[PDB]
């Protein structure tokens, strides 16, 4: 009835009731259709004797009863009697096979990349979701965009869309589709404008990753602002915590942000003539750490895209030559050289080639810069006194200066984009579109992975709190008296060692301050404070033949193993205020604009924690709506999705945590009439006072609640 109005896409949105009725009545068994593991499928159906193409006999306490054939295609795995990994896995597998890329997961909105053009979004024939609710219409992200619209118009409270970002595709197309939809419903457009200046962000905040080649290395919080009544207004972009540690140090088999090699592809010899810079990447230590180039992308055409971006951007000739000069200076910093003065201690420079280069570039003096690098001044009450500097201290300061310059330039460019993309009446409300990396579990995890997983722990706790208050509200609504320990925070608040003032980060800062501290002393301190005294902190099981870890954290997405080698040098961030004062006087007006606005204690972890606190503070004032874009397969061939990839992702994406919590229900929530009908073979009071346990149900105001493992009996 309400499905045949979507045309050629309705089959993808809601299958016709004919094949549905023939499929919802399959005769199968309860005790010969279970789930057993595998090495290439990791989960299979079979008939303990079990065979589906290969015989395996396993313990009788590891098999998962397969979902009943009643719910074998439901787009909402929150109502299943069997909430386990293979259940939802094959649920999604089937729903994608019989093409339906859209699904609901308790509160998430899982979308799968189809890789095949579909009219399921265009034209508006499918966009009829206006006025429609999630609980009635098919499970489309358009329903969620519309729900956020409705909530803004009826509640005057901002809304937020948290889309999973480490997936290479699916996320970007979904962002395009949701901004298009928001332009459509509440109608040189905001979509055009937003996608115009994107090459800037692509070149500045994306780098070659071990498990990617175009990786969002920051947080993009696109705010689409709406008028007083719900009319589209301007849209500003806001950036959050950026992995600035890469600007100097890159692991082996990775490289920093694209812009460096984009410039160094010798595409515009004008630039490589202006910045006194050659083209060989192995001459600059700040870029030649890992690999200089990947074969999966060109640099010249992307350089042209970024040039055209600066042109469509409000940048002039100076606001572009200055940026190129700053990047050239960031490269020239990498190979300045200092030596301990003969016979006492002091770091002094030997050769000033890159010194003069960078001094001319940023618009400073060379002798003044060298002196301010080797002799930083400080204000003692009312007087200034020179402070001594060793070689390693000079290098740390140089790195800190490079990182500060890069982040300042990034933020200024984002402000310029906000300016050129904003002209509108004073508006009230907006919708939050949050792009950010997700959880990571690599073969070799390090400081950056720890920071990213910490941020994702925070976001996941946010989602858990939202879902907890939702379920608690719904229980107070149906009069169902049932109270439980907070499903929101009390899960990760103990995996928040990383922030409490004795955990890993505080210990790392302490070790950054302490004399002669090394990695071994850092490991010793970690062990003395946590090994045995905490349950989430565990010693890794290091097997010879695999990379050596040093400790293991029990995250929500599994137990990750970290290798702390080098965290000390990576956490130090001593800013040299003398050189910053030199910057504030430069001739290159972009540099002075950057550093326009009675210190040696700065660490990357501290700035990161403060930025994360600010981001969570912003999010905690709005209403969230989460989306889980998935890459189904790696060979790009549509239709068939590999099971281990999608299983790992379903772990890291955050859906499995929601499943694990709703399993503590009462996941199955039905009214009276449906059970009165489908199980009348003999309202619900007498129908269930006859048989099972008396706690598996709690009736209230035409609502029955069933725990996971009861409809597998009916």
């Amino acid at each position: 009835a309400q499905m045949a109005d979507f045309g050629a896409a309705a089959q993808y949105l809601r299958k016709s009731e004919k094949e549905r009725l023939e499929a919802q009545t399959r005769p199968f068994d309860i005790r010969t259709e279970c789930f057993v593991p595998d090495d290439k499928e990791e989960y299979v159906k079979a008939k303990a004797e079990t065979e589906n193409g290969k015989t395996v006999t396993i313990k009788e306490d590891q098999v998962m009863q397969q979902n009943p054939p009643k719910f074998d295609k439901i787009e909402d795995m929150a109502m299943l009697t069997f909430l386990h990994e293979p259940a939802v896995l094959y649920n999604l597998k089937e729903r994608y096979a019989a093409w339906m890329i859209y699904t609901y997961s308790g509160l998430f909105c899982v979308t799968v990349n189809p890789y095949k053009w579909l009219p399921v979004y265009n034209a508006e024939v499918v966009a009829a979701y206006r006025g429609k609710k999630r609980s009635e219409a098919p499970p489309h992200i358009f329903s969620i965009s519309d729900n956020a619209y409705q909530y803004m118009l009826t509640d005057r409270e901002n809304q937020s869309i948290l889309i999973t970002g480490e997936s290479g595709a699916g996320k970007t197309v979904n962002t395009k589709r949701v901004i298009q939809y928001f332009a459509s419903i509440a109608a040189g457009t905001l979509e055009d404008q937003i996608i115009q200046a994107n090459p800037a962000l692509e070149a500045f905040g994306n780098a070659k990753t071990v498990r990617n080649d175009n990786s969002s290395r920051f947080g993009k919080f696109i705010r689409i602002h709406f008028g007083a009544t719900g009319k589209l207004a301007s849209a500003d972009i806001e950036t959050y915590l950026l992995e600035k540690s890469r600007v100097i140090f890159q692991l082996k088999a990775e490289r920093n942000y694209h812009i460096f090699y984009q410039i160094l592809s010798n595409k515009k010899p004008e630039l490589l003539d202006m910045l006194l810079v050659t083209n060989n990447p192995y001459d600059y230590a700040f870029v030649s750490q890992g690999e200089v180039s990947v074969a999966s992308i060109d640099d010249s055409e992307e350089l042209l895209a970024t040039d055209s971006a600066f042109d469509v951007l409000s940048f002039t000739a100076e606001e572009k030559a200055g940026v190129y000069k700053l990047t050239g200076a960031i490269m020239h910093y990498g190979n300045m050289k200092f030596k301990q003065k003969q016979r006492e201690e002091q770091a002094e420079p030997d050769g000033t080639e890159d010194a003069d280069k960078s001094a001319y570039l940023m618009g400073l003096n060379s002798a003044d810069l060298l002196k301010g690098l080797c002799h930083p001044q400080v204000k003692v009450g009312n007087e200034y006194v020179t402070k001594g500097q060793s070689v390693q201290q000079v290098y740390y300061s140089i790195g800190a200066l490079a990182k500060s310059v890069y982040e300042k330039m990034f933020n200024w460019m984002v402000t310029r984009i906000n300016a050129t993309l904003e002209t509108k009446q004073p508006r009230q409300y907006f919708i939050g579109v949050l792009d950010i990396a997700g959880f990571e579990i690599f073969d070799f995890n390090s400081f950056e992975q720890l920071c990213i997983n910490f941020t994702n722990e925070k976001l996941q706790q946010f989602f858990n709190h939202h879902m907890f208050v939702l379920e608690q509200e719904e229980y107070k609504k149906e009069g169902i008296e049932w109270e439980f320990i907070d499903f929101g925070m009390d899960l990760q608040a103990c995996i928040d060692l990383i922030e409490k003032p004795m955990g890993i980060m505080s210990i790392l800062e302490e070790e950054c301050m302490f004399p002669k501290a090394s990695d071994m002393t850092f490991k010793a301190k970690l062990y003395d404070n946590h090994l045995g005294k905490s349950n989430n902190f565990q010693k890794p099981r290091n097997v010879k033949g695999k990379q050596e870890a040093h400790f293991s954290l029990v995250h929500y997405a599994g137990t990750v193993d970290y290798n702390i080698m080098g965290w000390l040098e990576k956490n130090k961030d001593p800013l040299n205020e003398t050189v910053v004062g030199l910057y504030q006087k430069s001739s290159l007006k972009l540099m002075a604009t950057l550093f326009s606005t009675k210190s040696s204690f700065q660490t990357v972890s501290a700035l990161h924690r403060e930025n994360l606190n600010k981001l969570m503070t912003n999010l905690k004032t709005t209403h969230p709506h989460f989306v889980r874009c998935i890459i189904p397969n790696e060979r790009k061939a549509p239709g068939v999705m590999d099971n281990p990839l999608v299983m790992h992702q379903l772990r890291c994406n955050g859906v499995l945590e929601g499943i694990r919590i709703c399993r503590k229900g009462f996941p199955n929530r039905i009214l009276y009439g449906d059970f009165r009908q489908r199980y009348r073979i003999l309202g619900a009071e007498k129908l269930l006072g006859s048989l099972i346990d008396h706690n598996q149900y709690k009736f209230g105001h035409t609502k029955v609640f069933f725990k996971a493992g009861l409809l597998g009996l009916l």
Partner: protein
């Protein structure tokens, strides 16, 4: 599965794997404890240092040998030294290797009883064995007949062997060795 050889001695631990040509780890059989105050807050003070780590920090430590005259007279320190030898020097798991300990002749029975009890309980070795130092010295010399004079850090002993037969009534054990010469010097 390979086996471990752990010639203890009273002045030097020599450990390794059965089949090599020389011990893989050779360090002093010593345990040091700090005697002075300790002021730098956060320096990560260890309770005790073993092996040759206690030898480089010896300026601030008080050193103790847990073996006096071939006899183990401090079983906690000896357990520390064995734990070090297995986990930090050889870097193995004692649960996967038979261990061949060594002992001097004519020393109390409780010594070997405690050795084997320590091994089997607090290390869970699959099997063990306690040899006599002079017999092994004769193995290494490539002979089956001779009177071997072993003289280490704690005890000097002769063991006469003939055609692979020991003469236990002619074993003579003397109790001056390297350490008494060090003290006399």
């Amino acid at each position: 599965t390979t086996a471990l050889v752990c010639d203890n001695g009273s002045g030097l631990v020599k450990a390794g794997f059965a089949g090599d040509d020389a011990p893989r780890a050779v360090f002093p059989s010593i345990v040091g404890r700090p005697r002075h105050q300790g002021v730098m807050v956060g320096m990560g003070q260890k309770d005790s240092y073993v092996g040759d780590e206690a030898q480089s920090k010896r300026g601030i430590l008080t050193l103790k040998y847990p073996i006096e005259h071939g006899i183990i007279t401090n079983w906690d320190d000896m357990e520390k030294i064995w734990h070090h030898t297995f986990y930090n020097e050889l870097r193995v798991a004692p649960e996967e290797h038979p261990t061949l300990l060594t002992e001097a002749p004519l020393n109390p029975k409780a010594n070997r009883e405690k050795m084997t009890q320590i091994m089997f309980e607090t290390f869970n070795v699959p099997a063990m064995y306690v040899a006599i130092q002079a017999v092994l010295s004769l193995y290494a010399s490539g002979r089956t007949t001779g009177i071997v004079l072993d003289s280490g850090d704690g005890v000097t002993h002769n063991v006469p062997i003939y055609e692979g037969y020991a003469l236990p009534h002619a074993i003579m054990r003397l109790d001056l060795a390297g350490r008494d010469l060090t003290d006399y010097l």
